[PDB]
């Protein structure tokens, strides 16, 4: 097929910045290159057609260029409504192939999560389950490492992690981590600890509860 490569796959830029996304193809694509924008929650729109250069009816800050194998999309002044995933598509041969995507995010000052840990609710425990939950809230950058420790040891089995999209107001992320165990296993241990490693502190940020100071 013609393989289409976009570099980078992620780009953080400040609002107001000039952004450039590049797309390269494996053989000369003869300028039949179209660019698409996928907003949060999945709608997709045509922005630019025929080798970047032609605008469909998107803002005038979107433009593109290129020849042969290397094409660019550039946004001349970044707006909040522009954080999206961008895709190039070659229309020179069958199969139509698409680039792997470039996602945008608003660069911000680092923030550092506010962490909370929640014991299992009594209601859950009557059903023989015990989920322990840890919210890690309003942090930037998105990179964070969470480990669970029970009476001094393993993280690993039964942990589900979920991340929010970057907040449109302030520009942070949030994450919950939930450890699920059976009630029986839950009652053979004393402390439960949520430990976060974020590049905002050299010391982990730890939150814990002991089972019977409750």
């Amino acid at each position: 097929d013609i393989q289409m490569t976009q570099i980078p796959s992620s780009l953080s830029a400040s609002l107001g910045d000039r952004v450039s996304i590049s797309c390269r193809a494996s053989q000369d694509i003869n300028n039949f290159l179209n660019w698409y924008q996928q907003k949060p929650d999945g709608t997709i729109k045509l922005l630019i057609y025929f080798t970047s250069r032609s605008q469909s009816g998107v803002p005038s800050r979107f433009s593109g260029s290129g020849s042969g194998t290397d094409y660019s999309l550039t946004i001349s002044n970044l707006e909040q409504e522009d954080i999206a995933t961008y895709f190039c598509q070659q229309g020179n041969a069958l199969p139509r192939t698409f680039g792997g995507g470039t996602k945008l995010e608003i660069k911000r000052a680092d923030a550092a999560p506010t962490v909370s840990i929640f014991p299992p609710s009594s209601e859950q425990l009557t059903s023989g389950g015990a989920s322990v939950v840890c919210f890690l809230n309003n942090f930037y950058p998105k990179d964070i490492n969470v480990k669970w420790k029970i009476d001094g040891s393993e993280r690993q089995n039964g942990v589900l992690n979920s991340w929010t999209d970057q907040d449109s107001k302030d520009s942070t992320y949030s994450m919950s981590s939930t450890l699920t165990l059976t009630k029986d296993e839950y009652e053979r241990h004393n402390s439960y600890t949520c430990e976060a490693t974020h590049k905002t502190s050299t010391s982990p940020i730890v939150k814990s509860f002991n089972r019977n100071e409750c």
Partner: protein, 222 residues
Amino acid sequence: EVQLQQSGVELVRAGSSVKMSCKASGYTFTSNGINWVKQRPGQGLEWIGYNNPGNGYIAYNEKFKGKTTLTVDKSSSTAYMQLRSLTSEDSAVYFCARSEYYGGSYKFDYWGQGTTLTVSSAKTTPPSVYPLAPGSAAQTNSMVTLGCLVKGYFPEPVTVTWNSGSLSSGVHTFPAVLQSDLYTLSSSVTVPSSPRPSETVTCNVAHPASSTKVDKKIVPRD
């Protein structure tokens, strides 16, 4: 304004087939080809085929050929794609998009909203909702953070509200994650310490597919 309206079968079992539809309007249907594209949740976009309703007919990506049949019905102005023998790798969002010629090649200039194909073993299950009150050593000291864990439901979505929507600042609702074929999500609200427990805080979750509505007040202890 041309428009492309999709929906086909969204929740199916492995071994099944689905026939999805993309209804076009706002332009003469016969005049433009329809393309179908797959987005497997780990973002990339893949082309499946093209169907020209007017000018003869059909191409398939080698990969999708055979698993896919693309037809049209020119009189209702609908394009359809049929997927046969659906596995786990077929769960994705499928989009149809229109082609338009512009000097040399085609642009996919209007796209439908897409229809999610969930190949699953799970049946409609209402969530379990558990209130998450700060623990042991008193916690969240200034503001208090409270949560709600919505545990084994199927299908998506659930809607979570705090105090019937009065409490909408400070709330974070996390994208659901599929655990063993059922979804689990959570929501936290951070409130002033003067708000709780002096004022009632309740998380309200609605699950439209099982007709379930649950209200769980967050109270001290566990």
